[PDB]
């Protein structure tokens, strides 16, 4: 019917691309049409070397290595808040919930505490000028006291620029964009390989604060219709027993805490861009008498932000308040800078002991990448339930009855998440559900591209191994090459190289 | 301020059985072990070792009623035992700033029957999941772990 | 303790738990130059035998592998056979009758009624006229604007192939005028009409739709294919293939299963090669429709690559920052460089011409998966016991560079017979098995494409949890938005009931704060706290609030897909319904407008 | 762009909502706290709210037939009876596909009607 023809400047253009035998695209568009099998891809096999072969390489219980961790100084943290170490300054009142303007409760947790002693640094950042730090602290406190001086609350505080504080904020601009041919003639213009770094006990302690229940519900989640489908039941008995043991967990409370923590950052960084804001990091729970509550984990003070690209990075110093002294685990905090706050009172076994009260100061930096991914941490609820649903689903088509109750409704099930010095333990359902929620949470923190490119090639040495322990008799073309895809992700990430930790306990267990 | 003359400038020539309260706070031990604690001190109620850079406890002497210990601040790291032996009354101890490490190190308390209170602070047991739980278990006879009881709830002030 | 989920795997099988391995639910917060350089160089390395040409038209060096030396070591080769490759489509042509006739058959009814507006609907593209990439639309609508600026207008005409004609007479116009006044020569704009940016020009973009609509026929038709289907659908062919296998009676025949991934798979597949198989597919034809098909490989084959931005340098010594585009690269001191992208440069330069390099051998990813399934699909056919000739047999699926392959052989020496004459067929035809990726197993357990066989049930992660949110358009909108979400990934994506109830409670608490519609019962202090409470007052049936106004929340499982209106009609208060709709009201898959539809 | 987060900053402000004139004789300027509810024409949201509390009424039962098929899969829904479940080994029941099957348990449920 339609006339599409190919001429010159697309016929040349036919004419080169052809395999390397005929000179137009007419002759082997004739070829092709009267072309038949003759069997060339049998004498084509039988001239190809026999060194181009797939040999199944057998998989035995002593086949499988331990991952080689990496070696070199250990590891540090990179959150961008306090996991474990937080202190909270909580206040216990109520102001009809949600209207409450941040700045005002955070000079209500303020007042709570009577004890400030004059800052003193206690561990140097040992990569900047350690004062300006302790100036930064000193010019909040002198900020928050005019504030409290005022009759009236600014409900949004603007810190003055000066000069530690221009300092802390990485103003110390990087050098000025210029042109090639300016600088054409110089001493270098190199455009680094990552350093290597070792496990450090830390981040396997931080993982077991991580999991463990607190006294105070996080999350308070909405309401649902009435349930009158019985798989309605079935889903509402679930979901209400993951929240159930869930909604205390030390995870949600990170999961609250960054949620808050970055709406915070981003909403003033939209709003007041040329100058440095005052953030309080506040977040809200409801106590174990059902009472409400507003503690304060510390101060962010905002840098300039024009941010029109999403990468486009806005650099905040982030004060956290803390009981854990730095000059136990040095070489965790490596980024920070340390003062000491003041002395809090606290109970001990004989009277009651005077423990100093510690601030790390920190100059992050943050784009709205990373605002809106955080701002996001609450959908890892979503996933922990779906995996505990996954299993709970997988092992209920094993059989053919329902097995929720089977799983929650039952105090004799027990499984091998953890490891003392006695032999594999064995927590409830519950454990099991917070377990997951710290994993998918501490995804979400310490997400980073070591991170996917080990959970994608540490899966197909997993199911291997499981392969092998049903009795499968698993074959790997290529052992060797997998092992060194997965050791290739392992560089210094502190939470990578745990779950590497952890692959290694598990073969050692798992096939002996 | 070594622990012989130290022990003999708080006595104030007091005789050991006249001393209800011995402190001995930021001392400097002995080769790491203590000298010139006797068993003389008989009616010592309450003995205290704060930052005295001890490591090991296996030279403490024989006393009946001490119902109060303060080991907190040293390098303790193993050896309890011997304070469920050379000291059968004892009700609260703290072990704060120790390198206790393992919940094992933890298992000779479980013969002091009196124990009621015990602090672990900074020290590195309370680093693992379940830590108040699994030290409860081991120490049925506990009430007051690191100052707060088994429901969370902090010890009243009249200990 | 010391927690250790890994270990949860020590009672549950690692099928059940796998979601554990899964690290996000999201697009992760992170992510040039550099790695279109390692491409192209790895593509013209895997290639580098017997021939190497000169482009007429564009003057660039071109590398043509096809027919080249067959390969004697384990390294992928993308020296594909021409010979092998046509005996191969051959082969699945004979096995399933009249599919090549059938699929030419169904495309001839689209490109005569494809309008070039579906040019539009797709991500971004490259744009030809700005030299930078722009969305779809745009790049359609300047590209359209500059040939009318020229004696080019059949794409007046409404159809996507007049476009196609459009484009085929504009590769022929000596110089080409485009204004925003520069004009470019004839080998300029066929070298900005036949460039591949870090994504393909609008130029090419018309033929590739139409190669794949013609590859597309051929999957549905393809059994062994799982490219096109998805969810559900994708579930009942992998238990299906072991079906086909496993059963039988009185055997003493042994299966085994490889769980497969192509190493490099985009840079051996060759565009001569398609060419090859496009113009075996389109035989016996009319001339006109096997022309608009083939112009697609013709343009792939002589394809060139830009090289994104360049490299960005600073000196401390002096505190001097600068970016040198990649334009230059052809002649710039090697000093500035360190030696890992020296040597790159070193290994470049040869094949760059105006800025770009002319990557011919290989294929950029994602513009021929479905093409590229039906070679795989094809080897896989070789295996039926009628064309292996032997006692072993095999068979399988295949999508883009993810294959599963189970062989049936008497013994162990079978097995392994039967799998090297499956790996080495492929490395016929360009496709290099993965051995770094791969395992094997006794049949009935597996995985392909992240959905996960174990003993007949399957586990479908292929795709991440959405974002259960407030889509922004307005209040009738979200609440219709995002409770069709949650039910089509309940249907599609097969997420739990347990997950979608709380899912639905993540999102509301997402719509209840952004509006401040925080419901008369809470003591939300907010600027909207005041109206809604007295709402509340003067209702009796409090049920038939809307979420909007601070009424309960009546969504579960069961009633998804309802709208929240007809939902709460029933007992919504008539002194309610009559105020809430209102055709003349001030204010005005979402529908059932009402008072809640703002801009 | 991110429509969420601009919907976010946009209900934020005041009178985010764009109007026709007729709201000027239609809804008044304040309540009974005196909050603005629109301003020349730019809405507040609070100005929705009014209009569904206490505004121009209606008896009009049209919306039932106007959009039949939804109300039609109301009906269906308030008078279909459920069955018990069953897990087991892996056009109105297109609509409650998301209910009558799962990935592995089967929801036995008839529409009626």
New interface residues.
Partial sequence: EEKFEITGTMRRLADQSLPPNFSSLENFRAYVDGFEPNGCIEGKLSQMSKEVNARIEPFLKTTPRPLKLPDGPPCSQRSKFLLMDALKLSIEDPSHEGEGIPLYDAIKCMKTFFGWKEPNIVKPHEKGINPNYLLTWKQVLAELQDIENEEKIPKTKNMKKTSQLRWALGENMAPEKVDFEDCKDVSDLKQDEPESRSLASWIQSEFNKACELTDSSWIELDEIGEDVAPIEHIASMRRNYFTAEVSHCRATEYIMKGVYINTALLNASCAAMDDFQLIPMISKCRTKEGRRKTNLYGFIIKGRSHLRNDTDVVNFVSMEFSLTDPRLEPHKWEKYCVLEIGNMLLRTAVGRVSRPMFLYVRTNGTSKIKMKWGMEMRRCLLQSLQQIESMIEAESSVKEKDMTKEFFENKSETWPIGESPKGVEEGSIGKVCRTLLAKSVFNSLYASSQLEGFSAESRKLLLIAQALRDNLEPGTFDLGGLYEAIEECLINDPWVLLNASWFNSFLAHALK | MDMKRRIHLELRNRTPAAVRELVLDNCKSNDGKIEGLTAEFVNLEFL?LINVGLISVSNLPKLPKLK???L?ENRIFGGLDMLAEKLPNLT???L?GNKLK???TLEPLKKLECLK???L??C?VT????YRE?VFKLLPQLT?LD??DRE?Q??P?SD | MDVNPTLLFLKVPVQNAISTTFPYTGDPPYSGTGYTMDTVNRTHQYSEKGKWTKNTETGAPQLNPIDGPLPEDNEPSGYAQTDCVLEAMAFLEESHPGIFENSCLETMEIVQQTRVDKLTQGRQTYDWTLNRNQPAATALANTIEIFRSNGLTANESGRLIDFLKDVMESMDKEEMEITTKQRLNKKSYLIRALTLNTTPGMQIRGFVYFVETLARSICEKLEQSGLPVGGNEKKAKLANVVRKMMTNSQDTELSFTITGDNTKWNENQNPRMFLAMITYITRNQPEWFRNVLSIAPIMFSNKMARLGRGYMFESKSMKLRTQIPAEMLANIDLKYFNELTKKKIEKIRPLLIDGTASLSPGMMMGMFNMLSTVLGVSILNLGQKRYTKTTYWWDGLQSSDDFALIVNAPNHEGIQAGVDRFYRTCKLVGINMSKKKSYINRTGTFEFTSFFYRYGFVANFSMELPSFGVSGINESADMSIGVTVIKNNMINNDLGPATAQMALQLFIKDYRYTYRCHRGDTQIQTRRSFELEKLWEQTRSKAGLLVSDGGPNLYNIRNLHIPEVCLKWELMDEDYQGRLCNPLNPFVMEYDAVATTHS | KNPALRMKWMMAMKYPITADKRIIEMIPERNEQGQTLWSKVMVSPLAVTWWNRNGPTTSTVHYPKVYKTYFEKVERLKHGTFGPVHFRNQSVYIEVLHLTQGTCWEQMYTPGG
């Fill in positions: 205290s109060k210990l303060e907190s609260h101890l703290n704060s393992d919940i094992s209170s015990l602090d602070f900074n590195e680093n693992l999941n379940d699994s007051y100052g707060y969370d902090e010890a002030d």
